[PDB]
Design a protein around this ligand. Structure first.
Ligand SMILES: CC(=O)N[C@H]1[C@H]([C@H](O)[C@H](O)CO)O[C@](O)(C(=O)O)C[C@@H]1O
Ligand SMILES: [Zn+2]
Lengths: 214, 217
């Protein structure tokens, strides 16, 4: 069990950046005095770290830390984020994460959007008088509103982030029906109108409140 | 820029607006060429991108059928997007601003909702900042932990894990200042952390937001 404990502490020390990305790990003898454990426990812990891919060890050299890659960190977070959606409280936690992003977007637009950008937002809400399918018009207005909103700050990754957050939720649910989208879109349209009204008034507090009115 | 990208974007928007439903066949390549007035190579590139994005399914050489991205496709797309942007000079700045937008909402939340116990957790994190001003590694750990304490205030385990992982990557990625600059550089970060906590103690979200923007802008 001692070997598991030095393994866990060494893994945490690696994540805490107490060791860089070099051969930085101490020798076996130092690890023994550091933890007050025997050479077998130290040897076993190092072997487990190597099998996990956390260190490189050659020919009785000193271990070299190899931090988890971007893909493994991302893989862990994404599996966590995906699993939570199967629980009702996971859906609530993920909606709040999305809300944090959308709050900052609507507050930023209210304080920084030019008149040209505000007109772009309002145009996204413009429903044609001759529109034959009002439900389709609301779906179109919904997509177009969020694209303009997410692009206002000029950051080229924001739009992909916003779309990924909605896609993430949709992917865990069975396909949305046309009928349920209709009442959701009607609700969304009202909330978008109030947000744009607040952005026109350059009022971030009002914009945030229209977003959160639930 | 490219004609194929223009066809890609318009087709994606049409898919997301349900101008094509979920599961039906997209019009044929020939129909798409006339619809957009582009050549077949542009249509094929566009459809290939839509397949990569999980917006269409094309199996065993069939015609494209509208689908929706799975979790793995979404993750793959975000990871490819981040690698493309980070390969440009200064691209990491786009993610620094991403962290800032999320943390702005977090500190506003903290100012309105933090309990007295949560404020004490924050004050304790400031103490570890003050004791770490002369070691880069230690101060970076104290800096990350300070923002972790903030990120735990909502009680949201998904936001906290992702947000902290993001800022931890960003803070540790910045090249280290020289030894002579280090003490005062860390002190600037520490003083700004105090101002964030002070605004949260006064339950003033506007003040907390302003202190956060001086910290990260
Ligand atoms: C003077 C200065 O720029 N300090 C910055 C520090 C350092 O970049 C970091 O500690 C590595 O030295 O990071 C922050 O605290 C942070 O990202 O949370 C913001 C702060 O503005
Ligand atoms: Zn900081």
């Amino acid at each position: 069990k001692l070997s598991e404990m030095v393994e866990e502490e060494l893994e945490q020390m690696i994540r805490r950046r107490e060791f860089g990305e070099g051969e930085q790990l101490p020798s076996e003898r130092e690890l023994m005095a550091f933890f007050n454990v025997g050479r077998p426990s130290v040897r076993e812990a190092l072997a487990a770290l190597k099998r996990k891919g956390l260190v490189q060890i050659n020919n009785g050299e000193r271990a070299r830390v190899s931090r988890p890659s971007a893909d493994t960190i991302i893989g862990e977070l994404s599996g966590m984020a995906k699993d939570f959606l199967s629980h009702p409280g996971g859906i609530a936690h993920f909606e709040q994460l999305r809300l944090f992003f959308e709050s900052s977007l609507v507050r930023y637009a209210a304080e920084h959007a030019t008149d040209e950008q505000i007109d772009l937002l309002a145009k996204a809400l413009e429903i044609n008088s001759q529109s034959l399918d009002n439900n389709a018009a609301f779906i179109r207005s919904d997509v177009d509103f969020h694209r303009v909103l997410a692009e206002i700050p000029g950051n080229p990754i924001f739009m992909a982030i916003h779309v990924a957050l909605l896609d993430w939720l949709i992917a865990a649910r069975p396909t949305v029906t046309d009928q349920a989208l209709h009442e959701h879109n009607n609700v969304s349209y009202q909330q978008h109108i109030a947000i744009v009204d607040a952005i026109r008034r350059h009022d971030p507090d009002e914009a945030d409140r229209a977003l959160q009115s639930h």
